[PDB]
PDB file of C-alpha atoms and ligand atoms in Angstrom:
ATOM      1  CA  UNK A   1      52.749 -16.916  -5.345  1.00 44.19           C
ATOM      2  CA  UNK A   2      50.164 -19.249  -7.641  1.00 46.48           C
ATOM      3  CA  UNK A   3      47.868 -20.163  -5.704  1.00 43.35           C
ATOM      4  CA  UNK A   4      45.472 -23.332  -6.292  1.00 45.53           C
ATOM      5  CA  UNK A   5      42.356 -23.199  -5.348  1.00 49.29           C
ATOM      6  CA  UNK A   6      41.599 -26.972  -3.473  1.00 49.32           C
ATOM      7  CA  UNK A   7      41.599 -25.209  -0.028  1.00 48.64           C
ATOM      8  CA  UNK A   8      40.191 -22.045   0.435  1.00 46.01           C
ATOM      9  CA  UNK A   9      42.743 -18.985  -0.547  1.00 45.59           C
ATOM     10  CA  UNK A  10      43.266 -18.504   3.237  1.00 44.45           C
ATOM     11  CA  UNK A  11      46.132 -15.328   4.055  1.00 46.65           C
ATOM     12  CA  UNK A  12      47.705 -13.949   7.092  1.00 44.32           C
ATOM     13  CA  UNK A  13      47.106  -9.998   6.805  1.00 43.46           C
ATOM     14  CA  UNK A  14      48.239  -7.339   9.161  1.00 44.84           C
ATOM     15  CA  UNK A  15      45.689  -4.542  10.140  1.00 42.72           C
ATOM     16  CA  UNK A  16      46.120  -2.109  13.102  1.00 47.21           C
ATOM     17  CA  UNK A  17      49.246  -4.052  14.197  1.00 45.33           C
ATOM     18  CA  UNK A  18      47.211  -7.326  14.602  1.00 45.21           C
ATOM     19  CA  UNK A  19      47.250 -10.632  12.593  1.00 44.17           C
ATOM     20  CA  UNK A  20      44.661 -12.030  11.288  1.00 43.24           C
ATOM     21  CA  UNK A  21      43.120 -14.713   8.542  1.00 47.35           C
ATOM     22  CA  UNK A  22      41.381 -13.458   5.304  1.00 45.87           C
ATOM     23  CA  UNK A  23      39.878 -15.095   2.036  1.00 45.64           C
ATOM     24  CA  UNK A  24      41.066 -13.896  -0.919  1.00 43.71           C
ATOM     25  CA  UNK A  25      38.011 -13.163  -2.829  1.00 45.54           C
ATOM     26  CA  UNK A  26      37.511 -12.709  -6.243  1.00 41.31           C
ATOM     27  CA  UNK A  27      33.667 -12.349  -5.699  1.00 41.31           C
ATOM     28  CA  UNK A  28      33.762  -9.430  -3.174  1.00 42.15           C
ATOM     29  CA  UNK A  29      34.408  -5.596  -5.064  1.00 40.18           C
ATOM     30  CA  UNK A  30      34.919  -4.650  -1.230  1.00 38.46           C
ATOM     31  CA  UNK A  31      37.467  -6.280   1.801  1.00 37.94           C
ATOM     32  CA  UNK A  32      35.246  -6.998   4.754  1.00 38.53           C
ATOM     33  CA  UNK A  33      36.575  -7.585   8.107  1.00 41.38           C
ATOM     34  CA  UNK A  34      35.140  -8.502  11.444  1.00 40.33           C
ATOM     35  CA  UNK A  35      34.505  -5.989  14.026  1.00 39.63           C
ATOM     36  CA  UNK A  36      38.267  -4.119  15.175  1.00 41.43           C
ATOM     37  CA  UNK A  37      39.204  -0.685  16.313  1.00 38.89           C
ATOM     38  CA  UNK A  38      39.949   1.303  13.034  1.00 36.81           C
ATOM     39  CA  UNK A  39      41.403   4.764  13.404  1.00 35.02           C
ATOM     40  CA  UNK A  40      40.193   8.413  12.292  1.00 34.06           C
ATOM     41  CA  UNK A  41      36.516   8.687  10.834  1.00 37.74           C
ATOM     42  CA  UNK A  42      33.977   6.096   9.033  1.00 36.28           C
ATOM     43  CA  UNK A  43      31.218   6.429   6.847  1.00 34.49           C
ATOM     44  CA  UNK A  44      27.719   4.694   6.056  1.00 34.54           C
ATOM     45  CA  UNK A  45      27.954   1.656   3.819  1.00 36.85           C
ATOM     46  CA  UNK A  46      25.215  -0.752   2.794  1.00 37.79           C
ATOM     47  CA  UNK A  47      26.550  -4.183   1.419  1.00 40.50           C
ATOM     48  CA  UNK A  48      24.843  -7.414   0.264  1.00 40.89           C
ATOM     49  CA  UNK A  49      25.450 -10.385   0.229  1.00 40.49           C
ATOM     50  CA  UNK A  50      24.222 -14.399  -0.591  1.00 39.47           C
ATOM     51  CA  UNK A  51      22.002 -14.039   2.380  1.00 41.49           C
ATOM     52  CA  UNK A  52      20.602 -10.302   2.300  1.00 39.83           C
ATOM     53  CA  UNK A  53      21.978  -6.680   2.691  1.00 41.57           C
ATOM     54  CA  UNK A  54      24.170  -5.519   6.291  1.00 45.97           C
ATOM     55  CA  UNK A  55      25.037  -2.079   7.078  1.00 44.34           C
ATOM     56  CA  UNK A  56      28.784  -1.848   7.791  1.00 40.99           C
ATOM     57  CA  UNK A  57      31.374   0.770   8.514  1.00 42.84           C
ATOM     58  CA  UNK A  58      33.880   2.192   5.700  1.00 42.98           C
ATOM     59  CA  UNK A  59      37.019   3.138   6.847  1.00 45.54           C
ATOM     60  CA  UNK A  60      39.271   4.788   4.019  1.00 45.06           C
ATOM     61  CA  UNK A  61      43.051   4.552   3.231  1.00 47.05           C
ATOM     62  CA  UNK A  62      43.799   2.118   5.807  1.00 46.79           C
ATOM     63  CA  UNK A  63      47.149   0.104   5.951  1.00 47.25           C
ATOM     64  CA  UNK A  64      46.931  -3.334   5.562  1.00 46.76           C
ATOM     65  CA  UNK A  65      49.169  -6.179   4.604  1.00 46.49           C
ATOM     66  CA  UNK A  66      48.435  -9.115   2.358  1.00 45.33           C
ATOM     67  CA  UNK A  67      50.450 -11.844   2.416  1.00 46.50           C
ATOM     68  CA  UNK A  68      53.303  -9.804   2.833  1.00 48.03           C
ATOM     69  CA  UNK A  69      51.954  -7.160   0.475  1.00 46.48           C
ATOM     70  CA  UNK A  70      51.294  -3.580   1.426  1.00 51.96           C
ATOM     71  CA  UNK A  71      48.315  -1.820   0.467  1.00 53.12           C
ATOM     72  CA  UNK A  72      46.099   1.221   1.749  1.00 54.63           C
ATOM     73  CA  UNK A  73      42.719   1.647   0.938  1.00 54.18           C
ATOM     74  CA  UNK A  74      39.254   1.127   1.962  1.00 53.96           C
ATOM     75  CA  UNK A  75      38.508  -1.354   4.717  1.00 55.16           C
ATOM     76  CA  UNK A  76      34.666  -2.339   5.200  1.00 54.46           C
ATOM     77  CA  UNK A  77      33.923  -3.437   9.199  1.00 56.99           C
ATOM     78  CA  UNK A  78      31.144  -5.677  10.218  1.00 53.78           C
ATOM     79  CA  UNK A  79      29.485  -8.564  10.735  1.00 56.91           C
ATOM     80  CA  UNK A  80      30.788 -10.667   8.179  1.00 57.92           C
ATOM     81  CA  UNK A  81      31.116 -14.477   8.876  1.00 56.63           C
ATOM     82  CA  UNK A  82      34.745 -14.214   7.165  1.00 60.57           C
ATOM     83  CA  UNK A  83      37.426 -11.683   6.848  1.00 59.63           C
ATOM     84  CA  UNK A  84      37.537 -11.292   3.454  1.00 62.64           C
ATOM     85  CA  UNK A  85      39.894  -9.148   0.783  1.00 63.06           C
ATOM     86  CA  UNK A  86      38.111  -8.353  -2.261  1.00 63.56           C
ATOM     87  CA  UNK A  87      39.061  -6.797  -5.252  1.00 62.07           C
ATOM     88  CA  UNK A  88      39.895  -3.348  -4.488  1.00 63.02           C
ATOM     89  CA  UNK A  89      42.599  -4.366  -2.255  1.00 62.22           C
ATOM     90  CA  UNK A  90      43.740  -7.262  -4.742  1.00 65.95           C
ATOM     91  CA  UNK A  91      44.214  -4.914  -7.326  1.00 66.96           C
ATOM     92  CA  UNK A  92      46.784  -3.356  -5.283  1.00 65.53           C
ATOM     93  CA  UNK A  93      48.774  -6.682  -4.625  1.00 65.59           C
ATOM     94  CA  UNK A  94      48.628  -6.922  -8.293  1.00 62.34           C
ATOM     95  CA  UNK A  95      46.626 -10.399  -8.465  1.00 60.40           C
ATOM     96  CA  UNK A  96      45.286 -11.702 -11.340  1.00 57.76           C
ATOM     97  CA  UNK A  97      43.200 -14.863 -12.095  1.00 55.74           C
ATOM     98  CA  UNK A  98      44.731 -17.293 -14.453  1.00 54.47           C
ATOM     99  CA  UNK A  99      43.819 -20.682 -16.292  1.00 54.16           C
TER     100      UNK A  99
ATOM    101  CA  UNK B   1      43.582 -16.991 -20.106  1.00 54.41           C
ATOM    102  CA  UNK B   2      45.063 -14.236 -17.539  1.00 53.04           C
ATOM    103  CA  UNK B   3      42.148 -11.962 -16.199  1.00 55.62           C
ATOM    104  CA  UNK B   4      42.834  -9.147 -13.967  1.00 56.59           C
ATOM    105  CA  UNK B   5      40.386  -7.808 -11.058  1.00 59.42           C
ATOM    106  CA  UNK B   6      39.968  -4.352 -12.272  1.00 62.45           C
ATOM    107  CA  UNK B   7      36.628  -5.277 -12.488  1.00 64.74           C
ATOM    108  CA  UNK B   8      34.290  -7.998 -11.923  1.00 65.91           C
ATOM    109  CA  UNK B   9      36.038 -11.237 -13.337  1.00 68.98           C
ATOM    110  CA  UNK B  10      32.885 -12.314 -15.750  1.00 68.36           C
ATOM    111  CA  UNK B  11      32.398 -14.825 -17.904  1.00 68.99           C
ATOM    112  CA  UNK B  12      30.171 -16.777 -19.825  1.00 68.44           C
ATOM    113  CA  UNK B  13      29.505 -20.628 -19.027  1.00 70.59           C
ATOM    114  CA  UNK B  14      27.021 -23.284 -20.930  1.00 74.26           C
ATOM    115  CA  UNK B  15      25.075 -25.182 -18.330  1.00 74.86           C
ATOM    116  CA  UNK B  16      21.732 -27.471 -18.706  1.00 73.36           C
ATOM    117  CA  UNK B  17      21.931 -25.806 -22.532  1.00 70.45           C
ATOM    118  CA  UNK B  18      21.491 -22.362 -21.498  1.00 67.82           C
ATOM    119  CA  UNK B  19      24.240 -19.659 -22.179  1.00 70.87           C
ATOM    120  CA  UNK B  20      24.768 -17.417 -19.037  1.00 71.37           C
ATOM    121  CA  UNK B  21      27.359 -14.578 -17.634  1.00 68.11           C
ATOM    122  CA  UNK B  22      29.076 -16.216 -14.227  1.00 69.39           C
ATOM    123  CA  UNK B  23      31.577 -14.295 -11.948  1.00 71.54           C
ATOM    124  CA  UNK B  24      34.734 -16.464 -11.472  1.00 70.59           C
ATOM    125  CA  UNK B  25      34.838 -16.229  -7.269  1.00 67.51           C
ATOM    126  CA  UNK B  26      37.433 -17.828  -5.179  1.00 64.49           C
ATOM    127  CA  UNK B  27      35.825 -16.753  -2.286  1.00 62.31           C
ATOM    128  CA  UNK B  28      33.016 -19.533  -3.006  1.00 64.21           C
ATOM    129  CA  UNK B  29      33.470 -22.671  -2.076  1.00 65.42           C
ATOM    130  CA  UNK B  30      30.894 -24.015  -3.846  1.00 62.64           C
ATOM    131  CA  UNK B  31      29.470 -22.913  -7.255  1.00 63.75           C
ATOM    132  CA  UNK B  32      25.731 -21.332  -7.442  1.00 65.73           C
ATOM    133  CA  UNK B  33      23.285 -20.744  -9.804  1.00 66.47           C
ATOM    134  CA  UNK B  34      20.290 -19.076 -10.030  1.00 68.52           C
ATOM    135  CA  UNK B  35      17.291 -20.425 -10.537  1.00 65.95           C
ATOM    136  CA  UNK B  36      16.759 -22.955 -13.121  1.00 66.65           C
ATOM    137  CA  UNK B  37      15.878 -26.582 -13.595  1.00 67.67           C
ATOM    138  CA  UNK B  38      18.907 -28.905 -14.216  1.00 67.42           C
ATOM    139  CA  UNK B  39      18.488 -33.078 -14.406  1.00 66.92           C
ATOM    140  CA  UNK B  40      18.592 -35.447 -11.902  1.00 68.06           C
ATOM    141  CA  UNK B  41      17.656 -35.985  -8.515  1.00 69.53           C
ATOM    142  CA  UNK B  42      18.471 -32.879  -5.639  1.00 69.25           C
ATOM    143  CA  UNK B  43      19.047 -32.664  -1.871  1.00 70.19           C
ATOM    144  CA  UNK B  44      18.163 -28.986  -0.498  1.00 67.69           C
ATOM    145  CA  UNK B  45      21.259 -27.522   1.511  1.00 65.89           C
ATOM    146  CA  UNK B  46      21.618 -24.144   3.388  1.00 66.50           C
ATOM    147  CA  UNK B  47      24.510 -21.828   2.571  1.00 65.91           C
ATOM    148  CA  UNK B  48      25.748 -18.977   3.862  1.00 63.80           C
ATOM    149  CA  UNK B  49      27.452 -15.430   3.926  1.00 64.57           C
ATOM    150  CA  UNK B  50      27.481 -12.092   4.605  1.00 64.23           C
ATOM    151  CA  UNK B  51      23.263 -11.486   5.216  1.00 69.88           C
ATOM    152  CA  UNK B  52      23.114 -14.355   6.559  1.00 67.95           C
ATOM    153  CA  UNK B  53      21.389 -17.964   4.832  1.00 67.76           C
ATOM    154  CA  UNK B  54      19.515 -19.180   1.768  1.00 67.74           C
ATOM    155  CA  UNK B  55      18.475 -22.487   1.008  1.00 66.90           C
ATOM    156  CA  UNK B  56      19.409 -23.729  -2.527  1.00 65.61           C
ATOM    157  CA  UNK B  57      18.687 -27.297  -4.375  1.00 60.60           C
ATOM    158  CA  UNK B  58      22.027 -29.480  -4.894  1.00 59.18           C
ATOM    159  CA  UNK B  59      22.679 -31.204  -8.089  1.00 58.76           C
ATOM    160  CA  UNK B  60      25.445 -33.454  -7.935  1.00 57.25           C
ATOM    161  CA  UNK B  61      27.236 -34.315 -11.573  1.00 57.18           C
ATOM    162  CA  UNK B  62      26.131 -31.602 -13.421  1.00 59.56           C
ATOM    163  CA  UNK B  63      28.430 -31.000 -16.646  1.00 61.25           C
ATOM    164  CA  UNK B  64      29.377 -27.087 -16.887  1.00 62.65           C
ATOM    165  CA  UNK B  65      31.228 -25.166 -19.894  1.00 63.00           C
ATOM    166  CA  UNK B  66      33.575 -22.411 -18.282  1.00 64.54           C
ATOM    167  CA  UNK B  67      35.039 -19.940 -20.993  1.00 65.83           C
ATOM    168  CA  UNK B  68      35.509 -23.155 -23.137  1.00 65.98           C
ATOM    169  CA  UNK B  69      36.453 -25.567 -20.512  1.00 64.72           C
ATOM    170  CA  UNK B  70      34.368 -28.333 -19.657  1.00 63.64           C
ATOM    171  CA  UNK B  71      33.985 -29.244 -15.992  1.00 64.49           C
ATOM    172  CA  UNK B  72      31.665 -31.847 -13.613  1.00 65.74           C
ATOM    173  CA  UNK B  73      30.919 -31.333 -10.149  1.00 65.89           C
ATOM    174  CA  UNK B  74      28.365 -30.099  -7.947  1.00 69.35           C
ATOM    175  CA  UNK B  75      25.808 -26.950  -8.769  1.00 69.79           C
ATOM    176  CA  UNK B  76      23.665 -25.527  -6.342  1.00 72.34           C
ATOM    177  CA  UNK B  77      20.663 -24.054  -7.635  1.00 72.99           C
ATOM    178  CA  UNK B  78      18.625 -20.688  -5.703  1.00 72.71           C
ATOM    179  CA  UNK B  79      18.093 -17.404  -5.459  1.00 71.65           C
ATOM    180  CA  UNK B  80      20.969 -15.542  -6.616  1.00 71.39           C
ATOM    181  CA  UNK B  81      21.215 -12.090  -8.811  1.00 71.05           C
ATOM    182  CA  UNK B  82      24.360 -13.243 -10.005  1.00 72.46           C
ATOM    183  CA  UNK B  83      25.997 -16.754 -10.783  1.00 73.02           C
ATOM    184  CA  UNK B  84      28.880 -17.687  -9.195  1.00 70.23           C
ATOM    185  CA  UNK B  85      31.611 -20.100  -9.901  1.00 70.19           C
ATOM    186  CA  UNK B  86      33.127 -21.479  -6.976  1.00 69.01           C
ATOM    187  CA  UNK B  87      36.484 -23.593  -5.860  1.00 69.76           C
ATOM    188  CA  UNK B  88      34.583 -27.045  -6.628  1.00 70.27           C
ATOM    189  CA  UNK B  89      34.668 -26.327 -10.141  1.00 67.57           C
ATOM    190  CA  UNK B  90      37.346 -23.482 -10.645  1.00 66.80           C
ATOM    191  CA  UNK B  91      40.231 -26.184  -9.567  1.00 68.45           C
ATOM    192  CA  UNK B  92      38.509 -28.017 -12.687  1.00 68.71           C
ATOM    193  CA  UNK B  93      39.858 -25.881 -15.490  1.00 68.42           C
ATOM    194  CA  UNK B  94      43.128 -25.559 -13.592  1.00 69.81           C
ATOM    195  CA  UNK B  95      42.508 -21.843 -12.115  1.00 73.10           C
ATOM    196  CA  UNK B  96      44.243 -20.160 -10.128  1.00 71.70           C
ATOM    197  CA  UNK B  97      45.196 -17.075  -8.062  1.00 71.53           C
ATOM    198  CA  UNK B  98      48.460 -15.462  -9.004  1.00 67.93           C
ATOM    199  CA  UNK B  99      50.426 -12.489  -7.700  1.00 67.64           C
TER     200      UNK B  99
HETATM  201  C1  LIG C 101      29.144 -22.905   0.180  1.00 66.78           C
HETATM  202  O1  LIG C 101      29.117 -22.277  -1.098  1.00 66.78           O
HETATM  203  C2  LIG C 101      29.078 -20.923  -1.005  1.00 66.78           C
HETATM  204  C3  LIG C 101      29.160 -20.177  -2.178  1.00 66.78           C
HETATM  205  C4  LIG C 101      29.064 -18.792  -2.133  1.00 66.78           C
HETATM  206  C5  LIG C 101      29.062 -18.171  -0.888  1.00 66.78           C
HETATM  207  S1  LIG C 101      29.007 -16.416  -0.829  1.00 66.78           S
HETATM  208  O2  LIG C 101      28.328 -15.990   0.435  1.00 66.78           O
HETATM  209  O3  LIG C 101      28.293 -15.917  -2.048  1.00 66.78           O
HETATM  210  N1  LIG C 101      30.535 -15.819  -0.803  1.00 66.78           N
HETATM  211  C6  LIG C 101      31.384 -16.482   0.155  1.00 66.78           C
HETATM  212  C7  LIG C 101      31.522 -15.676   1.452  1.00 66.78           C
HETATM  213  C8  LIG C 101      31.618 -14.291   1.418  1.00 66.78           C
HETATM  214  C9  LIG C 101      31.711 -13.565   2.599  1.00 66.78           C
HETATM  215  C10 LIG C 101      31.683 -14.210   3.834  1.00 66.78           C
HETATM  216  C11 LIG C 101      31.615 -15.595   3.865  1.00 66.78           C
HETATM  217  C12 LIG C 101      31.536 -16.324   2.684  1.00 66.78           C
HETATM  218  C13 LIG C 101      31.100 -15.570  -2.120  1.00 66.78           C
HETATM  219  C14 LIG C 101      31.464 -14.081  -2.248  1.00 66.78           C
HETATM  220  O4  LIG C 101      32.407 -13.916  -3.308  1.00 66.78           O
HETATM  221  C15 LIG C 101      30.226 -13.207  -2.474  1.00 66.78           C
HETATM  222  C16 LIG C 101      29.574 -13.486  -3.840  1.00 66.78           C
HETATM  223  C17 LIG C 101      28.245 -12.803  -4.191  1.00 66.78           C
HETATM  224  C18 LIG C 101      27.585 -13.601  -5.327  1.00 66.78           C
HETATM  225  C19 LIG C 101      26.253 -12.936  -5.688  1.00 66.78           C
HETATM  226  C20 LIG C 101      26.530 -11.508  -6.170  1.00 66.78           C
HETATM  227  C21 LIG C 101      27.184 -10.717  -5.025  1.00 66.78           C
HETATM  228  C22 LIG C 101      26.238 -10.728  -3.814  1.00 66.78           C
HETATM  229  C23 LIG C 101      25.984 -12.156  -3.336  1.00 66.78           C
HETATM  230  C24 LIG C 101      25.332 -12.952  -4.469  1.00 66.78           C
HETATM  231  C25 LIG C 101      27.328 -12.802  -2.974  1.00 66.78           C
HETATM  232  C26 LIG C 101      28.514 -11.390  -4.672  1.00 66.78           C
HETATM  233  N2  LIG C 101      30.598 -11.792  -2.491  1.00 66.78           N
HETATM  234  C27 LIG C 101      30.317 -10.931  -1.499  1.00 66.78           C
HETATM  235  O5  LIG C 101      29.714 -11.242  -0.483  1.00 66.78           O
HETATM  236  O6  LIG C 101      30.782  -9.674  -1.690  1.00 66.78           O
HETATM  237  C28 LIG C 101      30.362  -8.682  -0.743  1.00 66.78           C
HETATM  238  C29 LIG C 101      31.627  -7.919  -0.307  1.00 66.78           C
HETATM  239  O7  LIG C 101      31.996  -7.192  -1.489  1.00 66.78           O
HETATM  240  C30 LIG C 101      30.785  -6.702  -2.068  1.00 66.78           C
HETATM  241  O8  LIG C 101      30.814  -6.843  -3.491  1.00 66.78           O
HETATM  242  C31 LIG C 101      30.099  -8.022  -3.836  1.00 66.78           C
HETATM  243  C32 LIG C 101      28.979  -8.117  -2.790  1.00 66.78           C
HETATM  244  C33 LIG C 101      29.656  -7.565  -1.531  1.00 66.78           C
HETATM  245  C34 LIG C 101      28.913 -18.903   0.284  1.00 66.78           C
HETATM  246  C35 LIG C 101      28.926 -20.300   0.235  1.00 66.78           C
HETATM  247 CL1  LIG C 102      31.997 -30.986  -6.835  1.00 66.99          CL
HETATM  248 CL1  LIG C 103      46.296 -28.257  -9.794  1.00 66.89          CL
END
């Protein structure tokens, strides 16, 4: 789709057969989502953002739809205020920012 | 303009006459600035994110240059390592989020 940007860029996605709401988000390298049950193994990750640094946990090559689009790659849990997809997962969908 | 999200989606902007490199974030709802003085009166105004809050200075009407475009709105001003371009001006030059 094009998507306008006068309301936040607010997707379904589909992680561990859940739904859920995410931001797409041109300003996060990483996608951040709130505390789930992830399987197989995660590993130390430090993160900052506007309001300081939070440890989180990095899950790798995990299946995740966005907005109908499949991808697998690395999902960042924590507690972030927002699910959020950033760009290593829009890369896979193949976004782009235009004007 | 089409950019892609390989990597961070930089670009310059002209604002209060300084030249400076801004990340084009959809995930913002509001655009930010680090610290500098801009005209006009201000109203402080707490934002937040992943870390948590900081508390920023709000210019309303401020005239911004984005990658050539001109564009009024809002600019919050605080501490930030890196400036960020949010929806309240990024629906100004007609951007948007395509895939
Ligand atoms: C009301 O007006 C607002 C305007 C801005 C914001 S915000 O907190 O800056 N955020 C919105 C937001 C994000 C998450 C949860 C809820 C809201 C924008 C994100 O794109 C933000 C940008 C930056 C802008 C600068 C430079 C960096 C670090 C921070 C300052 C936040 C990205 N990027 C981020 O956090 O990315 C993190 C995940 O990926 C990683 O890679 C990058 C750092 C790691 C909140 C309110
Ligand atoms: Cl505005
Ligand atoms: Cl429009």
């Amino acid at each position: 789709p094009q998507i306008t940007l006068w309301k936040r860029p607010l997707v379904t996605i589909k992680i561990g057969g859940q739904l859920k709401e995410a931001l797409l988000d041109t300003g996060a390298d990483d996608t951040v989502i709130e505390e789930m049950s992830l399987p197989g193994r995660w590993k130390p990750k430090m993160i900052g953002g506007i309001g300081g640094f939070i440890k989180v946990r990095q899950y790798d090559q995990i299946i995740i739809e966005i907005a109908g689009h499949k991808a697998i790659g690395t999902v960042l849990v924590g507690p972030t205020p927002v699910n959020i997809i950033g760009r290593n997962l829009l890369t896979q969908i193949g976004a782009t920012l235009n004007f």
